[PDB]
Design a protein around this ligand. Structure first.
Ligand SMILES: *[C@@H]1O[C@H](CO)[C@@H](O[C@@H]2O[C@H](CO)[C@@H](O)[C@H](O)[C@H]2NC(C)=O)[C@H](O)[C@H]1NC(C)=O
Ligand SMILES: *[C@@H]1O[C@H](CO)[C@@H](O[C@@H]2O[C@H](CO)[C@@H](O)[C@H](O)[C@H]2NC(C)=O)[C@H](O)[C@H]1NC(C)=O
Ligand SMILES: *[C@@H]1O[C@H](CO)[C@@H](O[C@@H]2O[C@H](CO)[C@@H](O)[C@H](O)[C@H]2NC(C)=O)[C@H](O)[C@H]1NC(C)=O
Ligand SMILES: *[C@@H]1O[C@H](CO)[C@@H](O[C@@H]2O[C@H](CO)[C@@H](O)[C@H](O)[C@H]2NC(C)=O)[C@H](O)[C@H]1NC(C)=O
Ligand SMILES: *[C@@H]1O[C@H](CO)[C@@H](O[C@@H]2O[C@H](CO)[C@@H](O)[C@H](O)[C@H]2NC(C)=O)[C@H](O)[C@H]1NC(C)=O
Ligand SMILES: [Zn+2]
Ligand SMILES: [Zn+2]
Ligand SMILES: [Zn+2]
Ligand SMILES: [Zn+2]
Ligand SMILES: [Zn+2]
Lengths: 346, 346, 346, 346, 346
């Protein structure tokens, strides 16, 4: 029979369907099953404490008033324009900072109704979500980004969100991040919000992200080591080259301070000490100590042969003493940060 | 009885409800009780003199025309789509610079009507509010951010806003700020605006924010101290190392000036002197005075044995004199800024 | 009598009111009186040549078709939703670059009708206005920001805008600007635009803004003076310290050039010479002249006792000659810029 | 007779006017005459290769179905709200990157109909247009900004755009640009676009913009000359001041390289050589050649009286030889760029 | 016959056309042929990993319900306003990050219907598409930008997208890019997406972009070579000029490190080694090795005639040894990157 007649006969004023009334107005709560498909992930900014995602959201629920038997087809697709005339849950995101739909040629929405009365709703969304980040162990850090799906207006007596038993979260093939590696273990947990207005359903997903070290090695760790070796070079210069040694020391100190200031150019102003901060502090301490060493040598050398051998012995000892202690510092630093890094992500 | 019939029987042309007429058209003023829930706080920028907040706003008032007795349920939830057909107050924010609603899957709005005729309206909002800031005592400062809720069109004869006796403001659990600590004492006060058009109701809330010092210590205070000690190092060098001493002095002076210029990179161009400015001025004075000291020593030393001991005595005195006076300056500086910092926030 | 009946009886198809027809279709022009209230002012950017304001706009005119006598109340407030059904003038801003309304909970609009037929319309607006700026005397400058209100579609035969005799412009209490001081004298003048389409009404307001000097003194003027004194220090060094003196001269010259380049970091690329540019040019000239002086001294000293006293006399003269001429330059510079600064703002 | 009746009698379902049908459905093409008024011009960015303009657009065409004779007035203004009910051309801009209307209090639109059936439509628009720029002769360049007006849906059989015989383009009085001078000769030409869908009408206007040199002289050309003179200063220093001369050479070379890198901070990454690039290359060559000269002198001087006079003669020749060749370079550079600059703008 | 009657007689409730039903509701799938015209291309940003394009999109399909025979004209243009009343495919872009229509004076849309029932739909779009980029061989790289057109709601049984046999992609004449060259070979391929909801049609186009080297040569490669030659200059200085040689070495090392840090100012933080990174590493190694060479020479020279000739021989060998090895490095570097660059783009 004519397709157009069936639509309004089922969902029209003649039938009496009301899109403002729940499938069971007084009865067991509506159970909504959800799954998400992630199409792109990125734009993770530490400064603005947020990340941007683009996902497909699928919702499933049963509406007994939409049960159709006469029509032959088991499953019926529909037009996006008729979404306004069916009841839909009022899902919202708690950590939502920015949100928009897509209207490129039509509304990017899908609806499907089955014989039993089950409804499948799929929509395309772009959301910028907020993510609290801990900046300790900043180079060697593992972050967790959450996404919370909640009901704004319906209490647990009316609406109950649940996760799909198989494949709640899948990621698009070939998705990669420049600075992070997305782990394949996704955490599903139950959250419930309590307010002065009542109890509301909530569901959450946690994603584990591991920072990549290559950029930080090429950028920060290696030039600091080069400056330390450059300061070490001064021990092999003649003690009579006072302007040369002083200029080398001053240049190394100023360069170290500038690099230390610039190492936090793209981070939020936190109030604790990071590992990169410890590293720059130790390197600045080494360069300053080398300059103070030459200062002491120059002070000792002008005290007039006993003073000549005493000043020379300091240079000879420091030529084989400064690299060994720095090697010990590197062993103690790099080991314990893989012990703690290996600590369970949870 | 059928749910759909009750809605239009109560709020329809048949009933005669008009959403453009107040609950008591000629009578005592409408009393509206409000409470806010803060879901996220952040984005406090000194340059643009504003901060961004995301809040839930709850309004309560009594409408005698909505009193329902026949229906069994004590409390009735509704659909967000029917908000257009009820009377709502015209609340606006005085310090509102930017505002938007949320439409992620539906309107993020709630409405509830009680048997007596009381209405509860809840809406989700994102607002960028303006906050005048005083930048004196800039590192050790306590700010106050206000939010004013006002009626645009109704005078005190018609509309009166009030605060809830219990729990007007609550904050979401676990909310933290990178650079600030939100105090738990919230100030509620009465504001009334007077214009040439009449008298209007207003309510205000004040939040106290304390800046965190860790970032400023790691960033500004410690490198300046390092430069001061670096300039102090020059007193232990031989007086005959004129190029070395002059280069050290010049490098320290230029570095100090660059750091002083860069200490105000992210602040509005105010016209008064801050504490950080006093600190950089004192450190620049110390480095310049050290350079002038060596200048005087070099001038004295070429005046040809009396001139030799006289020039040496200056170096020996300055080696134990410069750190003591700087220690006294640190004692006087750091104490009085905790005395004044302890001054009552109000 | 019932409130709802009066509204549509007065402004309905039964009455015959047409919102597309002027109050007097063929007759004397409509006279509109306007006043503005300024709620916030700021965001003055020299680069983008514009400033942002947030104002309340009040319009008053007489509509004989809205005269009501029967109803008892002298003055009737209304609902913002009914603005579409009354005639309103088509005011627009000539220097309008950006504009938006406010819809935080309702339309931020007010309407009031009186017994005689007078209408008061109040609306909240945010406008980014364009302001041509003259950058000569850049530190010591007084700017003028204009705002023009014009009719887009109605000629002088139909619409005539006028200013209110008392209190056209008032500013909110406690409004302050970080870098400017808003003067309390506001200029009201008559503007009329002439085009190929006809004659149109226009009204304008001029605001006087005075720049604050504290920021520029702390930032630019004092470090340049410090560099000049640092270059002056070289005159007291021994003439045999050639590397030290040359390094001091080069460092001062390079620092001066860098500061001169950085003094125009946040300004439009104008093609004339500003006062700050004259100041940096004079300081660069002083440092370069000092370096050329030492160059001449070094050239003279190697010409082999007559040459020894001749080279020494230059250093002794320059030690008491360079500060005096710089003091004379400061007297001539600072005086005449207060003479011209005192010139009437108009 | 009543004004309201005439409007719907002329343009209503009773009359039979259809706004989807052209004035002559089958017949000679519709001829549309256009003129533009420029109210503000600016925001010319080389990086984003675009500029922003704000214009008034006037369109004129004849509609025989709108001919009115009975009503007395020769010319009838209308309300902006009735624009939807008349046929309008589908003009679009080819180089349109961004576009928006203005709705400050009403739609900024005008419509006027004459007795013969002629229609005048005026609208206010803000458009960011794309402009391909040639960066050779970058300081001394003349650009051309185009604007193309085209029909999206109508072929030449239906719609034909033309320019007004008198005053197609006029500019608002007092309009000025910070970095450019707008020439008073405007080029009007005929463009026709050919696609696989048919032939479409197009009209274009070309504006000539001349860059101002004052900013570039104060910023780039003069500090480079100062660095060249600073390098020249080294020729008058004693040949025994090896650290001083080497430090001067190195500082000049590094400063020149930094200025050369910074001279292209605000330009697109083009792949050809500009005039500023030639200038910096020549100045870097001069400083490097001076350093190589002192290197050769120092190498020659240690070859042990014949070697003493030979090394001294190089310094004496270079003291009067380096400025003369640089003067010749300035004569050859500055002349030919005014010869080519004088080349006809077309 | 009257034009207005034909439109609603064909597409009206009287006819029974339903825009929610496919041309063949139960039957062979609808075949849609598409072609795109590119009007502007640009805004390729490595950081935000995306590019902006402005295209014309043409869709063709057959609708048997729109077959018209009586009317004389073979082809009928229409009005953009009637697009809502015809069935249109639900095309969407997979890599769509931002999208907007154009409404400058009317909707920039075209529709045309033929006698047989074929429909042509043309629309103007602006889309910011995402493009994964490989940054190895960063200066000498060839990128590929994709665009995927997919159906959101219809499975392969209903909708099938295909490419036009002649001229699927054409580019506007004279289109050029500042940093890239668009290749004239466009790749057309078949993509099919598989999800848990079904099978969906997809089509893709690949564009090949070649980076231009001129900017990188003028900017990075040549100053690094200048610094290397500047470090080479030190071999011709006297071994007794210890402050001069040490200062030259330190300045070259610090400049090299700063340039290496600044070479990645506008790139995403990738974790692999690029060619520019190899180049800067080799140049830093050369400057550091030169400084270590002078350090060894200075250490050897103070070991007290055998030590004099031994230290001199190192300088003489290094004066003809450092350029030859650097030339060999340039030959090996530049050749193999043209071998690999010549590798087929696919
Ligand atoms: C939604 O799911 C809940 C939870 O399973 C269902 O509630 C249960 O329903 C069964 C079957 O009638 C009862 O025997 C249980 O006592 C219920 N348990 C609870 C905790 O309520 C509910 O029926 C489901 N709703 C619908 C419409 O199917
Ligand atoms: C809104 O609150 C005001 C303030 O309490 C109420 O005004 C008072 O009402 C009581 C009870 O009728 C009177 O006895 C007082 O004289 C009123 N005081 C003032 C200052 O007006 C008002 O009645 C309340 N409105 C409603 C609708 O309940
Ligand atoms: C608007 O104001 C104008 C200017 O005052 C009025 O025009 C005058 O009206 C008076 C009173 O009728 C006449 O005597 C004058 O000759 C008019 N002068 C001019 C220059 O037109 C006008 O009447 C006012 N309009 C209304 C509706 O009150
Ligand atoms: C639009 O302008 C065109 C160009 O002038 C007109 O076409 C001409 O019309 C005249 C007068 O009827 C004819 O004699 C010419 O042969 C036409 N020339 C061409 C090239 O078509 C056209 O008539 C105008 N349209 C209207 C509606 O006035
Ligand atoms: C759309 O194109 C498909 C692919 O060519 C058509 O399917 C074929 O139709 C022919 C003609 O009837 C059949 O003989 C083939 O067996 C079909 N092949 C397949 C793989 O389906 C289809 O008919 C076209 N649809 C329309 C409406 O023309
Ligand atoms: Zn986990
Ligand atoms: Zn308090
Ligand atoms: Zn004035
Ligand atoms: Zn021309
Ligand atoms: Zn290919």
């Amino acid at each position: 029979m004519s397709p157009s007649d069936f639509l309004d006969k089922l969902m029209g004023r003649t039938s009496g369907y009301d899109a403002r009334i729940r499938p069971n107005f007084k009865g067991p709560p509506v159970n909504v099953t959800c799954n998400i498909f992630i199409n792109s992930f990125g734009s993770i900014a530490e400064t603005t404490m947020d990340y941007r995602v683009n996902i497909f959201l699928r919702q499933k629920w049963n509406d007994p008033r939409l049960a159709y038997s006469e029509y032959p087809d088991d499953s019926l697709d529909l037009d996006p324009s008729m979404l306004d005339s069916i009841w839909k849950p009022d899902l919202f995101f708690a950590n939502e900072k920015g949100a928009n739909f897509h209207e490129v040629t039509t509304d990017n929405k899908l609806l499907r109704i089955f014989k039993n009365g089950n409804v499948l709703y799929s929509i395309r969304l772009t959301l910028t979500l907020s993510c609290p980040m801990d900046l300790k162990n900043f180079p060697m850090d593992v972050q967790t980004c959450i996404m919370q799906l909640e009901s704004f207006g319906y209490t647990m007596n009316d609406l109950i969100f649940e996760w799909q038993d198989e494949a709640p979260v899948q990621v698009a093939e070939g998705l990669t991040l420049p600075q992070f590696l997305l782990k394949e273990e996704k955490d599903l947990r139950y959250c419930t919000k309590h307010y002065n207005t009542g109890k509301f359903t909530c569901i959450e997903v946690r994603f584990h992200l591991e920072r990549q070290m290559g950029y930080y090695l090429i950028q920060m760790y290696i030039p600091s080591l080069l400056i330390v070796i450059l300061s070490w070079v001064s021990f092999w210069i003649n003690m009579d080259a006072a302007p040369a040694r002083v200029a080398l020391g001053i240049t190394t100190v100023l360069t170290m301070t500038t690099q230390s200031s610039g190492s936090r150019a793209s981070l939020p102003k936190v109030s604790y000490v990071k590992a990169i901060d410890i590293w720059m502090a130790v390197c600045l301490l080494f360069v300053f100590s080398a300059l103070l060493e030459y200062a002491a040598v120059n002070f000792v050398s002008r005290q007039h042969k006993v003073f000549i051998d005493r000043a020379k012995k300091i240079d000879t000892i420091s030529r084989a003493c400064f690299p060994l202690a720095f090697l010990i510092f590197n062993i103690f630093y790099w080991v314990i940060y893989k012990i703690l890094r290996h600590e369970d992500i949870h």
